Structures are given as structure tokens and as C-alpha cells.
Amino acid sequence: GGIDVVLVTGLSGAGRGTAAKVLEDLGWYVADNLPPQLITRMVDFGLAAGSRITQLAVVMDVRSRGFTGDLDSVRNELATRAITPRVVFMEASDDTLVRRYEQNRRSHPLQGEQTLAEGIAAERRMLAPVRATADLIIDTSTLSVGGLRDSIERAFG
């Protein structure tokens, strides 16, 4: 209960990692791609003296082992410790996501048996219910990195 927990999630390529880095610039301890089942371990570590963390941000998304799209089990276990996480959900238009993948030349996490476009759509379907529980949805369709820096500063300042 003595640690602010932020969960950063959302569409791949919408800026999860960039948003994580902004939080780091603001003084948050950021852990990326922690499996849901291990968040209680991380929170207990943060509460122990000597290794104390007062502001913890975890990036959890389609890559995270055992993440299915619902944070209910995560929210349940965190509540037994008097913690209510703030969930930030990154998204962007299909057109912006496609452009970012063409520019980086990375594979989409759900691409392989389907196209890049089909992977984006499958991720949108997977995450629509958790999106509706996010405390903050940030749409990066036309945001620069500096614009994301300002949006996050405004919400975590």
C-alpha cells in the first residue's frame, strides 16, 4: 500500500516503451515485460526496506507470459496489499501503427500466420476489454516523442 503502481499496456507500436522511458525520466522505477504472475513478487520487493521502491511502473502487454488481456487477477492480488494500480493504455490509428512498423522494419508480435494488418486487428480485439478499464488512454497517432513527453508529464506531474 506504500507504493504507487502504474501498469503501461496497449497496442504494439503505439509507444509503450517510449511512455515507459518518460516515466523513468520522471523518477519512476520501470520494469518491462514482467509476467503477470510475478507482479506480487515485484511489489513485495519494492516494499522491503533497503530495496525500497515508492513509484513502480510495469509494462505488461501481448508479449508478457500469461497475459491474456485481463488485469483482474493482477488487480485482485495487488488489492490484498492495499494497492490499486493506475492503468495507462497506449493506442494509435491503424495507419500510424503500420507506418511505424514500416519505418522500424520490426515484426508485429501477432504477425506470422497472419499479416501485419491482421496482427494489429487481433491485438485490438484482445485488448478492447482491458482498454475500457484504463485510467488514461493516450492516442499517439500524431504525437511526436516530445508531445508524448508533455502528455505524460501532465498526468504524472
Ligand X SMILES: CC(=O)N[C@H]1[C@@H](OP(=O)(O)OP(=O)(O)OC[C@H]2O[C@@H](n3ccc(=O)[nH]c3=O)[C@H](O)[C@@H]2O)O[C@H](CO)[C@@H](O)[C@@H]1O
Q: Does 149 belong to an annotated binding site? A: no
67 interacts with ligand X by CB under 6 A: no
The total number of residues shown for the chain amounts to: 157
Residue 30 or residue 87: which is nearer to a copy of itself going by CB? 30
The angle that helices 39-47 and 72-79 make with each other, rounded to 10 degrees, is: 30
Among 11, 19, 23, 34, binds a copy of itself (CB under 8 A): 34
Binding region for a copy of itself (CB under 8 A) out of 17-25, 75-83, 84-92, 110-118: 17-25
- Under 8 Å CB-to-CB from 113, ≥6 apart: which residues? none
Identify the bridge partners of residue 91 per DSSP, sorted by sequence position: 139
CA distance 114 to 103: 20
- Under 8 Å CB-to-CB from 17, ≥6 apart: which residues? 32, 59
150 interacts with a copy of itself by CB under 8 A: no
Contacts of a copy of itself in 37-56 (CB under 8 A) = 37-38, 41-42, 45-46, 51, 53
- Say if residues 10 and 17 touch (Cβ distance below 8 Å): no
Among 1, 54, 63, 128, binds a copy of itself (CB under 8 A): 63
Binding site for ligand X (CB under 6 A): 12-18, 21, 24, 63, 100-101, 104, 106, 108-109, 140, 143-145, 148
